[PDB]
Structures are given as C-alpha cells and as structure tokens.
C-alpha cells in the first residue's frame, strides 16, 4: 500500500499471510509494480504454493476485487450526523433525513433518526423547538476531530486531571495524550515489572492518580477488566513516550522497552496527532490551563525533542540530532541560527557520528556542504515569511 | 513621601498620627512642600496641638531627625552575603570577610562568619575546599530576588504543588502568587463566612489542598497558629485576586469584599511583582511546567484583565476598560489593532461610560480624539520595534 517500487519480478512467499489467507483487494496492488515503465517489456508475478495450499492460492489469481461497502447503532455514523448539524448547515430534522438520502448507504439501494437520540443522551446536543443546536461539548468534538465514542471517555478523563495534577514530570501530561494501545507492540510483563520497581518516586505518583495500581502491575498477569486493561497499556504507552521526549537513544529503548524502533515511530507519529487533538479539544471547551500544558507536546512528540530544541526544530532539516549537536554549538534559537556563519556549521555537523551521505526527508541523500547551507537558508525564509 | 505638592500654608492636625507620636524624619518633609518657587515669598506650617499634647508637639519643632542606622542573626544580612558569593565575585572566605569590612556597619566604627553557616544548613551553598559554590536553590533565589527567609517556605510550598494541582480555576495558581497579608486590609470574618459558603465546588477543592480548613474558617475566630493564620489570610488574598483577574467592577468588590479600592490596587500591584518573582524562581529551578502556568499571571494581576486582553493591554494607554470595550469592537490582538481606522475607534471609545476628559497615566488628562489616535500610534511603534 506504500510508495511505488518497480521491479521486473515480484515473488510472494505464501498465500497465507500472517496466519490468514491473503485478501483479494491487496492482491491487485500486490504485484502491480511488476514491470517498469519504458524499461521492462515483461513483468511477472510468481506466487509460491505448497501441498494443498495451491487450491487456496489459485483463488487469488482468478479472484476479483470484493465490492465496496459503506460500514454505516454504528460508531462511524454518530460522527456523520454530528459533523454536519454542529456546523450549522443542517438544522431541521427533515433536512437531516434528506442528508441521509445523500449517503453511500442510500445510493446503494430507519435508524438514522434514532442515532440523534444517542447524541441527545450524551449532552452532545441541546433539544429545542425539531430544530437542533450544538452544545459546548458538541462543538469541541467536531473542531478537534475526535470520534464521539472516544470523547465521552476523554471528557471524564480530562476532568479527572482537573482535580489532581502533577507538574514536575511530563508523565501525567503524557498520559492524557497517549492515544490507545491498538496493537503497536507486544507487551513484556516481567520486563515491565523490573521497570516498575526502578521508577522514581515522582513518576509513581502519577500511576496511582490515573487508576494504575502499584499492587497489581505485572503481578496478576504473570499468574494468569477491559477498561482496567486499557489503562495499564495506556500507562506503558505514556512510559515509553517520556523516554522519547527525553532524547534517549532509540537503540537503548529497544534494549530497555522491548519494542522495536519501527513501532516507536509508528507511535510517536500517532501520539503526536492525539496531542494535537486534545489541545484543540481543550481550547474549544474553555479550559485555558491544560491547553497551555499540552500546547507544546505536539511538537515534542513528533520529533522526540526537549523544550530547549522546540524553536531550533522549526527548520525542516533538523529532526532529532542535527538540532541537539547544533544546540551545543551555542545556538539556542532559530532567530540567531539564521545569521550563523556558513563555514561554521560545517565542522560542528561533521562531528557527533553514532559524498551525498547526510540524509534529509523528502530529497533523498545530500552532501554536508549543501545541507549545512540549507540549514541557514531555510532559516532565512522563516524569519520574514511569518512576520 | 510622595510627589511634590506645593502649597502656601500647610496645617497638621495633631502631633499624634494614628495613636503614635509623629516621627521627626517625616516631619522635615511634612513641611518642606510649603512655599512655591518663584510664586510665594513666604511659606508657613501650623501644627495644631491641644492641652498637654503641646509639650510633645513642640519637641518636633526643635527636634532633629534621628541618625541613620544599618539594620545589619539578621535577616537583611543573609541576603547580603548571598548576593555576592552566588554571583561569583567573592569565593574565598577571607575575601568575604573584607566585604563585611566594606559595609555600612564596618564604616560606622563577628557574626558574619557565623551567618554563612546558616546558609550552609539550608542547602543554599555547597561546601568545598574554604571556597563556597552556589547550589541550584541558591542561584534561583538570587535571580528571582527573593529574601532567603521567604524562599525556604516557598520552595516547600511550590514543591507541594507537585503532589496535586487544580487547573479548572485560577485559584491554586493565584494562591502561590499572593505575597503575604502584611496589613493591607482589616479582615471581616462574618463576611468571609457568607462568601465561604457561596464558593462553588471547584474553588473549595483548592482550599483543602493548601491547608485551609472548611471546618475551621471564620468559625473559631468568631468564638475567640501563626503559620496557620498566615495561610487563611493568604487564601483570602487569593480570593480577592481571582475577582480582580475576572474583571469584576472595583466598586462591587467593596460591597462584597469589604476592602476598598485603595488597598486593592496597593495589593494587585504588590502581588504582580510576586508573580514576577515566583516565575523567575521556578525558571532557574528547572520546573518548566510551573513556569508555564505562572508566566501570564504577572500581566494579569497588574492590569486586572483576563487571558483574552493580554495582547491588547501591551499598549500603555489601555489599562483595564479601554481594552475591554475595544475588545468587543472586533479587535482581539495588538497586531491588527495597529491597522485600525482612526475615525472608527472614536465612537467605540465614546460609549461605555460608568475637552481633555479622558485620562491616561503619566500625561494627566487628554482629549478623546488625541488619545484614540495615540491608541493606534503606540501600536504602530510596537510592531516593528520588537521585530
């Protein structure tokens, strides 16, 4: 499903992928890169099958793409009518029924009106004379673009951090921005238990405040609760993220946190969007205090930086190390980094090693002299373009 | 002790001022304003005395102001040596002894060396080979310019916001920036009881978290503890300040809080400096989360504004109401207020009334047309001067 990678021959291992038979839809694009344009006159695909799996494998070849559905109570439809009647375009209920005639479900060829009653119960909508108006929670959910199922828990979760908060460590703030667990990694309970003990006093205060139990943490799972499960794995996601924003090496996290570097960036990129949705959610809800605390946490999670390097990282060519080593060079802000000597940044960038060898996202490799000049050149444009 | 107020005749009511005899030092400048330069050829003062008070009154006429002292364990000397050994100028103890030879005490003509030991006990200085070096707490106190006596309590009080913090209301943030009680007003306990009951649920949570007791608050004082007494007054000072930053009418606070407008601005100006010292104190101590919450509270306490008008108030001619009515005119930031139509701001400033009739601090009265032009004109100069 990613970027095109042309090749003359594409060979597949088994029709069974990850313990399940291969889907037809992915099979159309499975080998569609075979045959380069204007270079290869023939592209071929060779699915490898064994014993009786050939009967299942050949179904991939003669199969046709499954017809599309609409997947539309349904959780994907609650947002559908919330997203429109909260924008003010659709107010009358009869016009809403007309909108449901415009969906994919309607064009394919009852409970649409009953889903509004679901929104009435959860205070998302105030009932008037029927003509419907948004509430404070309803207008905040749309603007931040959260699913209404998740918001009901967040609003109570964020209102429990109302009463008690900690500020010396970034953990409790990070706990409110960790999205979920999904299946980003396989948990290691014994390793978590050793990590649970070695946690300092300040961080352990956070866990008790959000429902995580010191007595039950990597204790009962060894010897053997869905909402209690979703909290402990939320805590592990927050525990991992705090090391990410502490600029610890990613190799060290692998040896310590057990999750490979592939699943880390698949989290910090996903958890950075969450911090960008909680912050907007708290802005529209009139909570000006943790909107301040969570304001800087979207940039920190995206790049895995500290508070110091927030301004340096604004240049697109400084991801996580090109700003740290540059920070130690006496340059602490992007304003004066824009005025840096071109020859000065060459030597400092050469050191700190863990012709087009230095890499920058979007332009493949680059040479050190050009990239170092790009560090300053990008900083020139930012200074006047934003002012 | 204030601004020069020339007058031809000055009359003093009694030698007794507030139940105490008048001080000679203020008596010299009591009369010193009599006689205008180049206008009045004769200035006189008539002290008024009765019965036996004349003997006390006449003593000031033939008396002389007392000679100066040095006021230098002593609390004003602890900061004196902390101001020099933390700045790095004086490190060796023997050289520090020469500093005590340079003060007013030495020039007038033991415990100085016994007072640096007091700082050693309270972690303010680390002891090395004697050569003294500042600590994290020692360097933070100097930068924020707090008395070392007050810092020991603040450090244990600010660190008690680590345990639990509230963010729905500004009360807990305000409680940590209320300086003290001094004698800014006379407390009204029965009036505080009626106010204590009517406090919403969110604010009452703050009081229990800082030591204020719901069970004992305007309860035992009616029927009849220095550290406990200084907390309850600290809470009352925070309750008053929360109304100040809510832009409630100043007249309404009098009818509700019992303290008149004179002691209000003499406290919000004093509490604004405190927020400017706690913020710097937390900055140097490496508490980046706490500095975030208190960063905006120096500007809010000075002007009695909300978060919305923080940017508008940057113009020196918008104190507390010239920005609120201007805010409702569709102008929410100082960037676009600088581009406002000159004739447009005239009509909006005319309304909201609770030729030089409008007033701006420092330039006495002004006319509406000129001041409204000054509103934009000051905004012109700010935009490019800071960039």
Curated annotation (Swiss-Prot), chains A, B:
Phosphorylated by PLK1; promoting interaction with TOPBP1 and recruitment to DNA damage sites. Highly expressed in testis. It is found in: Nucleus; Chromosome. Residues 355-387 are annotated as: Interaction with RAD51. Homomultimer; forms homodimers and homotetramers. Interacts with RAD51. Interacts with ORC2 and ORC4. Interacts with RHNO1; interaction takes place during mitosis and promotes POLQ recruitment to DNA damage sites. Interacts (when phosphorylated) with TOPBP1 (via BRCT domains 7 and 8); promoting POLQ recruitment to DNA damage sites. The loop 2 region is involved in the binding of the 2 ends of resected double-strand breaks and homomultimerization. It is linked to Breast cancer: A common malignancy originating from breast epithelial tissue. Breast neoplasms can be distinguished by their histologic pattern. Invasive ductal carcinoma is by far the most common type. Breast cancer is etiologically and genetically heterogeneous. Important genetic factors have been indicated by familial occurrence and bilateral involvement. Mutations at more than one locus can be involved in different families or even in the same case. Low-fidelity DNA polymerase with a helicase activity that promotes microhomology-mediated end-joining (MMEJ), an alternative non-homologous end-joining (NHEJ) machinery required to repair double-strand breaks in DNA during mitosis. MMEJ is an error-prone repair pathway that produces deletions of sequences from the strand being repaired and promotes genomic rearrangements, such as telomere fusions, some of them leading to cellular transformation. MMEJ is required during mitosis to repair persistent double-strand breaks that originate in S-phase. Belongs to the DNA polymerase type-A family. This is DNA polymerase theta. It comes from Homo sapiens.
């Amino acid at each position: 499903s990613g970027v095109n990678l042309p090749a003359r021959r594409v060979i597949i291992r088994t029709p069974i992928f990850g313990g399940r038979p291969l889907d037809i839809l992915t099979y159309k694009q499975m080998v569609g890169r075979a045959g380069r344009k204007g270079v290869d006159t023939v592209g071929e695909s060779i699915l490898i099958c064994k014993n009786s799996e050939k009967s299942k494998g050949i179904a991939l070849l003669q199969g046709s793409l499954k017809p599309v559905r609409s997947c539309l109570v349904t959780g994907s439809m609650i947002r559908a009518i919330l997203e429109i009647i909260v924008g003010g375009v659709a107010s009358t209920s009869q016009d809403m029924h007309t909108y449901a005639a415009c969906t994919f479900l309607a064009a394919s060829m009852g409970a649409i009106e009953a889903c509004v009653m679901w929104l009435l119960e959860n205070e998302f909508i105030q009932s008037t004379e029927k003509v419907y108006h948004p509430t404070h929670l309803g207008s905040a959910t749309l603007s931040s673009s959260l699913s209404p199922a998740d918001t009901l828990d967040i609003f109570a979760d964020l209102q429990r951090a109302m009463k008690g908060f900690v500020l010396e460590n970034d953990l409790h703030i990070l706990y409110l921005v960790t999205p979920m667990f999904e299946d980003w990694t396989t948990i290691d309970w014994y390793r978590f238990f050793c990590l649970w003990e070695k946690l300092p006093t300040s961080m352990k205060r956070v866990a008790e405040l959000v429902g995580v139990e010191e007595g039950f943490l990597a204790r009962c799972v060894k010897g053997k609760q869905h909402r209690q499960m979703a909290i402990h794995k939320r805590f592990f996601t927050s525990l991992v993220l705090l090391d990410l924003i502490s600029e610890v090496p990613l190799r060290e996290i692998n040896q310590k946190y057990g999750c490979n570097r592939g699943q880390i960036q698949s989290l910090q990129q996903s958890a950075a969007v969450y911090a960008g949705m909680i912050t907007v959610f708290s802005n529209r809800l009139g909570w000006h205090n943790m909107e301040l605390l969570l304001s800087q946490f979207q940039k920190r999670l995206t790049f895995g930086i500290q508070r110091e390097l927030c301004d340096l990282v604004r240049v697109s060519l400084l991801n996580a190390q090109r700003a740290r080593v540059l920070y130690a060079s006496g340059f602490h802000t992007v304003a004066d980094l824009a005025r840096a000597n071109i020859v000065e940044v060459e030597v400092i960038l050469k050191n700190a090693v863990p012709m087009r060898t230095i890499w920058v996202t979007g332009r493949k490799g680059l040479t050190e002299r050009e990239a170092a000049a790009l560090i300053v050149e990008e900083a020139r444009m930012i200074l006047q373009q934003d002012l």
